[model samples]
Target chain A: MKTPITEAIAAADTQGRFLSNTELQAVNGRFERAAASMEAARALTNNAQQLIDGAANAVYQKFPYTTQMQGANFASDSRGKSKCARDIGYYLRIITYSLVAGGTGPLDEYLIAGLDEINRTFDLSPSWYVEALKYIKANHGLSGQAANEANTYIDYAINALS
Target chain B: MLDAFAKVVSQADTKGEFLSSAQLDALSNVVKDGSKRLDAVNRMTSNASTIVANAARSLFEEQPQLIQPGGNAYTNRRMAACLRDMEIILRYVTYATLAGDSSVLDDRCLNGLRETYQALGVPGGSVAAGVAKMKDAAIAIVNDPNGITKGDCSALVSEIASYFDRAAAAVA
Candidate 1:
């Protein structure tokens, strides 16, 4: 009768005792934010196309010299701008996956697997990627609990990617 | 897709071989509140019909267009599907409650559901409103102290509310 969860229960507390008050408070506080967080996720998902274009614009706006950096893949022409938008859109989509899962732990194997090196090899600036994540954090149009949770994901990505 | 143990193991595999203190506390908390989870699910399941029927009635009341001629729920056939869809959502929410995860609900139920509704000319926002209605009804029943051991279920209640919100969000 001892399954994984039952065993987890036993290990969680000795002699079948319930979770302590402190534990409940800690977990509850976190779970309480789930709804608002998901609202943020939904909003982000709904406006993902805009966010993608916005982040691409923000990237170029923040770093106008990137296109002029000779060797940088970011070009000033339509081709380069298109690539930048496509790549930014791709990155934002992955973040949405992590945002929904509450964390990347569930799919780190696929999500975080050598992605940095891939971008690195793609001649994309790590800093460009970093700033794009920041632009998203600022431009997501969320506030209060929604922004708090959503930004946490962005912050995690910012630090993790760098 | 992952249960408690599987969820833990995958997370542990992510980094830091050991399960974090927070993670262990979560697993332990689920175990501790396992009964509350069961109670919440049981209430939703037992009262499935009442919740669905009333929510549907309320939906039509709120939006008369749905049951009018040339409407999705205009006939008993489509009405049965609408009611069944609500029950399906509720069933998945309860399963999510039991698993303490939304993936089952997301993967099995909500996935592609909005698209299906959109293609069928069914109103997703209307369905979402109904899901929200069910959220209120189910929470009241789950939180009812009569005939059950009363405990601080604020966490579980919030968790359930989040799942319902997710269902609504996905469709709407």
Candidate 2:
């Protein structure tokens, strides 16, 4: 394996080895920027889901039963409660993919869990933020690079709300 | 369960509802089949995300200057879109399966899913074959029960596996 950063750190470890203050500053700045990006992405993703839930709720009110949603007519229009719920799940799944790809983790677990709930219950919670926190707290032992990155974003999310 | 399904369709039909027992059976079968496929799809999406993420990370590692907040946007966006299409098609299939009044693999859903898979930036042969096979199985379930053999599931499992393999290869 290539120890990309370690080699630099090792260089500074003994004798002529030393990470310059500028190098340290650069690394710190990179991490700070990454954290900011995570915060922005999380907020945007949550907002997107909220709008979907609102639309689904409206659809459910208009058509109360699954049987009421049949035929090519209903399926062609993607505004029914089932379709909305499915869209919410679909959006969340893709968001999870993006978040994980962006080096954010453990968040996808909540996203998937939320997707499962939408699929099973065919409705959304009043607030996704509270649900996300509860789920994160419940599954706190996550360990890995992605989980570590997620923890930082979680802090940002909580702070953003505060 | 089948009895309940039969009863529901019978009751609905008696009341001048828009469903039939055969339709209900086909719908229920698709639900079962779709559920199995969703499990596979989820795993495949997960693998695809990891592959994309790892590949992007490797790129960043080789040239640390490329590292930035939110990483690479192009790869991230494409992967998200690809996965979104997969989830949407699956949900559409599932809901269509549950609705049970029509063939879930309609032109609209099939075309949309196919387009997304093609846009995934991979060699399309494996994924297209997999999707085609799955479509065949879905059609058989709805129109020809006698043709719905045990091998249908196995075929899908293999096709989906190849789908993931191709997606990962494309990413790498």
Candidate 3:
């Protein structure tokens, strides 16, 4: 599907008539500020692996509970902490996908659809999904308008997880 | 699990004093609004089964895959499971509307609902869609101008809407 940005533009003109004056202006503004948007995309694609892993460590640091028995980190004989890290990777991928195409669209569907309830039944740890995304934003490297655009998408993911 | 009325009176009871003038006025409004609240909650309770049933019908209708094989609502029992959660959510929503507070709704019904469903492999988003459908049905019934006395119920209507919205947000 379309990225949220594209959906935003399309939502502006559902009927596809001569878009209303406001819709026309919104299109213009988006195109005019297209450079910043592209750079935001660049930042994500540029260092995505690092960005995801970075956020993962940040969350692990914030909540060590994931490694314990009460944790949903999901293992005994191995490093259960990887369970926490793997999810952050999934989330960061979902965020970029939301920006690139099919967004947090089905995210609310599959993400927690699998994570939270199972976590609860499994004696899952606290719902720190929100903070994981927050740490993602903090580690995301972009400044000025690029950072602004990129942060917006990550915020969208964080809100969805919440 | 305090409803608004029980909640406020308990606050005063803990301090061992009569309700202050403002508290009295508030209770007076609660007494005044009690009729409408009762009617609203009553209407919801009576229509509870159909609300969930009809909402499920729409959910399966618009999102046909839910009833298709390999989907979350695929089996007859699976379908009933969805209905069960919707009914649970509506139960607490009506509770909140009657009390004019979301405390019971949040604490009892919503706070960890996401995990509750996820544990069983229920589709959180689809369930939210079902809640939304129920929200529309509940709002329509509660705000229906007919079969009830005429008054400015805009406030009650707004508050009722919030409870339903909060329930949907919690799981979704």
Top TM-score prediction, candidate number: 1
Tens digits of per-residue lDDT, candidate 1, A1-162, equal 122332333343343223333433433443455456456657777787888888887888889987676654766677788888877766665555444445454335444668778876877677887888888988888888878878877787777777
Q: For candidate 1, give the lDDT of residue A36.
A: 64
Q: lDDT by residue for model 2 over B35-117, one digit each (tens)?
A: 44543343333233233334334434454432345332236665465345444444444443343322333444554444554
In terms of DockQ, the best-performing candidate is 1
Count of backbone collisions within predicted model 1: 0
> Which pairs of residues collide in model 1?
none
- Model 3 chain B weakest 10-residue run by lDDT: B74-83
Docking class of 3: incorrect
Q: Which 10 consecutive positions of candidate 2 chain B have the poorest summed lDDT? A: B142-151
- CA displacement after TM-score superposition, residue B128 of candidate 1 (Å): 1.0
Q: Residue by residue across A1-162, what tens digits does model 3's lDDT show?
A: 444455656776686655467766655776766677677766777887787677766656676654454432343324455655665666665566545433445444435344444433334444466776777678777899878877877776566445
Residue by residue across B1-172, what tens digits does model 1's lDDT show? 6555456555544553333446545654555566677667667767878988888889889999888898888788998888888887887777667667776678767889877877878878898899999999988888888987757889889989999999899989
Model 2 interface Cα RMSD in Å: 16.5
All candidates: CA RMSD in angstroms? Answer: 16.1, 28.0, 17.6
